[PDB]
Amino acid sequence: FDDSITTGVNIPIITELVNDTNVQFLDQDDDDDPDTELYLTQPFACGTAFAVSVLDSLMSATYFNDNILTLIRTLVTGGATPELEALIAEENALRGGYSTPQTLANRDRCRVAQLALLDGPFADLGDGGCYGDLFCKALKTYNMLCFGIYRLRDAHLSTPSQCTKRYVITNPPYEFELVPTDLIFCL
């Protein structure tokens, strides 16, 4: 790509896979024999390969706690109230309303996005501060939940390269020193 590779390999893509052994072929940095199961591989840990077969463990997880499939359904479909799912079932696709000021309260439940520790009022904590200071001050000031760090693979000093592959860590402790290259899963 022009400069006016720009990213080239660093275009962020995501790929569904029919199988699970085919996760080896997505990256050229794998160390994966064909019994290293699917959660340990790099294209799944970085978040660029979503096989369908990781949802086979959901019905074992739904049986033990009923409110587990209803927490990921909302979070994920966004809306999906059964009062709306019925209306899509009635005739067709969606139907429009005329924006009464109680349906405008259905807006602004939660946005889901990630943001960087390179600027803003968090970079003073996002350079050397503990993660437990970062979580408490986001709810205190801006009221969003910091529930995960999108850690770059070579943030540990390992001959600094252009590998922009970032992996996912879920709910780090009150400890766990940050790096300014991190991205934070917020709400």
Binding site: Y39, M59, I72, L75, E85, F135, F147, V168, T170, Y174
Partner: protein
């Protein structure tokens, strides 16, 4: 459901448009546990969240699997990862001490004190219409009888939210 119309069943579907037929069965009560799992709604939903924040297709898909917590030592990108693959969503009722508190005060009191991340509540607008609320602001206060959606590594530690009081646990 003809043979025993009280049994809980859990169904995988393949399309979304024809999980509406399961509403038509009169024994099917999803408030009792009869929840059908669509696969074209969740696959294309986890991908649609990764277009907003990349990694949510594997942020979420580790939160409902009993992952084999092995401990790697020498590596650095796999040691930080496998400490985050043993975290799972658990539910537990909030104690009576949280009643009247706003949501951002509660998650602070859960993460600082209990060391538990609390992602959502179950607000009892009605017993037949109870919405589920991820991260509300200051508009809400905790009712007695709201269910607490946590994230933790142990089923033991999630019980300590039901035992939070201002007498000895605090």
């Amino acid at each position: 459901k003809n043979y025993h119309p009280k049994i809980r069943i859990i169904t995988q579907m393949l399309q979304y448009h024809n999980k509406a037929h399961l509403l038509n069965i009169p024994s099917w009560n999803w408030k009792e546990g009869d929840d059908a799992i669509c696969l074209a709604e969740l696959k294309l939903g986890f991908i649609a969240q990764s277009c907003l924040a990349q990694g949510l297709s594997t942020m979420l898909a580790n939160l409902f699997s009993m992952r084999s917590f092995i401990k790697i030592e020498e590596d650095t990108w796999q040691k930080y990862y496998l400490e985050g693959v043993s975290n799972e969503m658990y539910t537990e009722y909030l104690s009576s001490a949280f009643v009247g508190l706003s949501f951002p005060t509660v998650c602070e009191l859960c993460f600082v004190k209990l060391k538990l991340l609390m992602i959502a509540i179950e607000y009892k607008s009605a017993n037949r219409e109870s919405r589920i609320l991820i991260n509300p602001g200051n508009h809400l206060k905790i009712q007695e009888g709201t269910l607490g959606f946590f994230i933790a590594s142990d089923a033991k530690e999630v019980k300590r939210a039901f035992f939070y009081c201002k007498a000895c646990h605090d």
